[PDB]
Design a protein around this ligand. Sequence first.
Ligand code: UDP
Ligand code: UDP
Ligand code: MG
Ligand code: MG
Lengths: 270, 270
Amino acid sequence: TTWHRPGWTIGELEAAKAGRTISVVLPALNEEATIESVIDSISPLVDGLVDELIVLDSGSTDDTEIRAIASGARVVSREQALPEVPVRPGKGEALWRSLAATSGDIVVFIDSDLINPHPLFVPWLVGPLLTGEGIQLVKSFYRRVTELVARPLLAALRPELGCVLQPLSGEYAASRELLTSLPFAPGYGVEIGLLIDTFDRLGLDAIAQVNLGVRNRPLDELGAMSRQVIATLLSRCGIPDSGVGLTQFYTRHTWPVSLVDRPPMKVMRP
Amino acid sequence: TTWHRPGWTIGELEAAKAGRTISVVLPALNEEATIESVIDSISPLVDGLVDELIVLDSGSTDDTEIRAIASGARVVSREQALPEVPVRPGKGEALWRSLAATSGDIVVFIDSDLINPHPLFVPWLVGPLLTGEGIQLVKSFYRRVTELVARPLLAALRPELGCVLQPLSGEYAASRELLTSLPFAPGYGVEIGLLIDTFDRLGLDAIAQVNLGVRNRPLDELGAMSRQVIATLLSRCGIPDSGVGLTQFYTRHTWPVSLVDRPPMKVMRP
Ligand SMILES: O=c1ccn([C@@H]2O[C@H](COP(=O)(O)OP(=O)(O)O)[C@@H](O)[C@H]2O)c(=O)[nH]1
Ligand SMILES: O=c1ccn([C@@H]2O[C@H](COP(=O)(O)OP(=O)(O)O)[C@@H](O)[C@H]2O)c(=O)[nH]1
Ligand SMILES: [Mg+2]
Ligand SMILES: [Mg+2]
């Protein structure tokens, strides 16, 4: 179901959580310009509704770590998250590793690139989870790879999902149980994979969708992001993807594409 | 092979044509603003290199027909092209019907929306056909659904084709033999279908690619165009496409998608 209008209060939400804990992950790669306002918008909730918040630094070479530390956030490196396993590039890798660095019964994911996030994003996302039943994933929407790639593709291969307005949204929450059960697609495939894998396994009903209000990058990427979105999506649907990277044109350049998911994190914690 | 630099002259090209005729099709739906300059850029060639040029009017309700008639072009309606078969919406329908209205051994397709086309487009497209051998299709490139949908998708499902810079280009030429052999995908699928169907059947070598120099619409469409591009492409690759139209969001709207190709025009002319 879909909440076009969120309206729980931090106090009632905190109430309804009934012993379950809530972690918050901000994945960040070189986001020094926005990282502070993102953290700051959520800071106050910590020790109340939110029990834990960390920044997953995916190898920033700018001032992201220091700015975030200055805003009172725990910063975890991909290496710190899971020391025993060498590190892979891409967003999916970081979201995956973040599971090992957190312990909330509920994990909320919020991108670090957001321009002045609303302080009610977390409580709005965590809404259906705390007050509903059998909701395990809640995606957000607001206001493109999403409108030209992901959404047409779902109409074609998983139309039951063509009602998701933002399949690729970086802002969503889920139970720890579901996320540890699932593989994690590499790079920019992670979001579309979790959507399909959750649907395929729990049905359209474990999935909520909430309005977050209102809302970038070069066509150089995007092409690349689109490619991986296609590979993850094709794979979840039983279509063999070639493995070949998108080539951009003179002169030539081939962006990397990965057909390798991470296993469910359950596996790694025996 | 790829001509990064075209350099035949109307006189030598005309020479090399050795009895083969050349038709030119401008499909047009409501293009009153550009139709004249497109025709005008090609007019002079008629009775020389080009033997026949027509405008395929796909039901314009503006002044396209009259402007084009005023520029000395034959205008054919979809109905006139093939009276005996009721008319379907979409670009593919019009390109298909145009085969019945022409008789050149070589058909050249040029979009009617082009801003001040170069007068050497036709001769550059028809180049490899007239002076090469075993080239049956030549696509153009210059300077997106193309960069986010069509091109990533070909990397994934027909990577041998990921070297085409403009899979979706509206400017291309082909032998009458090849085009009558092929089915024609509906609407905005027509281009991607002909590319795949030609490759699958004649190999990467019957296909040329020429530089045409240098170079629009709302994300409302595009979404829709992307969808049909996905359905035609999925179908050529043996993937069952759901048949479900892309739904846009409040409030709702579902754009049409077609899984129905036209049969090879050979069939219709017994
Ligand atoms: O290797 C990584 C690790 C993390 N992130 C982070 O994950 C989020 C999504 O990145 P992006 O904004 O580029 O995705 P988009 O919204 O552009 O599709 C951001 O907060 C990133 O810094 C990333 O893009 N790549
Ligand atoms: O039902 C039809 C019949 C013809 N055309 C024509 O075919 C070409 C391609 O249309 P468009 O420029 O919209 O394609 P785009 O380059 O935007 O992907 C144009 O000259 C159109 O007027 C069309 O789009 N739809
Ligand atoms: Mg982002
Ligand atoms: Mg056009």
